[PDB]
Paper text:
The most striking difference between R.PabI and R.[name] is that R.[name] cleaves the DNA backbone at medium temperatures, while the DNA backbone cleavage activity of R.PabI is very low at medium temperatures; R.PabI only hydrolyzes the N-glycosidic bond of the recognition sequence at medium temperatures. Both R.PabI and R.[name] are members of the HALFPIPE superfamily of restriction enzymes.
R.[name] consists of five α-helices, fifteen β-strands and one 310 (η)-helix and forms the characteristic HALFPIPE structure using strands β3-β2-β5-β13-β12-β11. In this region of R.[name], three catalytic residues of R.PabI, that is, Tyr68, His211 and Asp214, are conserved as Tyr52, His222 and Asp225, respectively. In the R.[name] structure, the insertion residues of R.[name] forms an antiparallel β-sheet (β6-β8-β7) adjacent to the active site. However, in the R.[name] structure, the side-chain orientation of Lys71 is flipped to the active site due to the insertion of the R.[name] specific antiparallel β-sheet. In contrast, the results of the DNA glycosylase assay of the K71A-D225N mutant showed that the fraction of cleaved DNA was highly increased by NaOH treatment. This result indicated that the K71A-D225N mutant of R.[name] functions as a monofunctional DNA glycosylase and that the side-chain amine group of Lys71 is important for the DNA cleavage activity of R.[name]. In the R.[name] structure, this region shows relatively high temperature factors compared to the protein core region. Although the structure of R.[name] was determined in the absence of DNA, the R.[name] structure is most similar to the R.PabI structure in the sequence-nonspecific dsDNA-binding state.
Author numbering:
A (entry chain B): -2 to 11, 17 to 23, 42 to 55, 61 to 143, 147 to 154, 162 to 186, 195 to 236
B (entry chain A): -2 to 25, 28 to 34, 38 to 236
Write the structure that this text describes.
Amino acid sequence: GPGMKFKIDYELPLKIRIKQRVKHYVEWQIGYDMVGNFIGANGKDKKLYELSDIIFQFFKHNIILKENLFGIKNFLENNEELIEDKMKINRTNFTQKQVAGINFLESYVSYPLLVYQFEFLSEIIIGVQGMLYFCFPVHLLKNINGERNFLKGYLEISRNNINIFLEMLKIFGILSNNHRYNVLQIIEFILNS
Amino acid sequence: GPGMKFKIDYELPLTSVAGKIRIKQRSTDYGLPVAININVKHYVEWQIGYDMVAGKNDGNFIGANGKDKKLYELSDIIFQFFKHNIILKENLFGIKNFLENNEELIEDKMKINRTNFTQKQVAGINFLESYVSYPLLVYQFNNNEFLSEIIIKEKQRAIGVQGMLYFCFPVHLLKNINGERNFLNRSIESKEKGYLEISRNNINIFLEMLKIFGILSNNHRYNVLQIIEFILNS
């Protein structure tokens, strides 16, 4: 349907990993671009993909207002608090530890992780790099025919859950400087188009 | 040379990435990798093994996993120095009796920790923050130049933790192709090889490393015990 009736049945092959803690969920290492619509932070030909493809279509069908994209743009342009700079890896001081009578020095390396709850949730784990994972129960997916008969999958996106992907784009925009630059280029492309 | 003069100039590929040999710089503690003149803080990181899967003709023992195995790197070094009568039989027997009586295993005592959550706000966005803490064990050999570090990670597709042993020592200890220790204050040439001199003066470092492998897990204990028995009966 057009306008507010617009939906996307996103095909998900079964970057996709299936794990379990009804406890089984989809682990989607979702991206926003692909190697053209804009110039990435690395200076390569980048085009819209996945997350940005979803936002562009729902903006094209007038479900996402341009005022929302303007607010996200100004938020990402004005913000200086980035997740990569706020997530610090900690290393403890070496302490004496004996195993099997052998004297070792023991230290712990702690890697932070962030959980954003939207039932959906986003997880950011950790040279090193931060990796974003969009997670949701697997029984939410419709089969190839079009019914949740799992308890290829298809994730239904509509006006009732598009805000999950707008929030996820905003989170990407504060993950790192490279992501902040790329997301700003994507929002500029969507607003101009 | 012959007898007590026996040595091994172990060839180590220096300019190589995505392999068992890596070059890092020790930050006065911890170290960070490097890609360039070599100074005293540059170390060799060697993810050394003690065996290798063998074929139907070159097998030396059967490992804990039931696979054909043969000597490799650490165990081959110990075999040659035992073959040339530098390593005493009592040294191998002492390690054998130690591994037979030992009950504390590294993969059973080392724990990966997940901390409680805390509320964390970044850019005005509220998150739940937690930490995953990985232990590492460092063993300082009697020679203050050599050390080994055991990194503890999760078992892949299994329950528990696994240890990866790395053998570390300064780059300036290595000899070039001419037998010169001239790496200090000099950049490493392309495809250049470093040579770690192993002799009677430092062989016990490799014996202590074999003992450390033997306490890593029950499978490692079994494999080391099979290696000691094979070497003793040679």
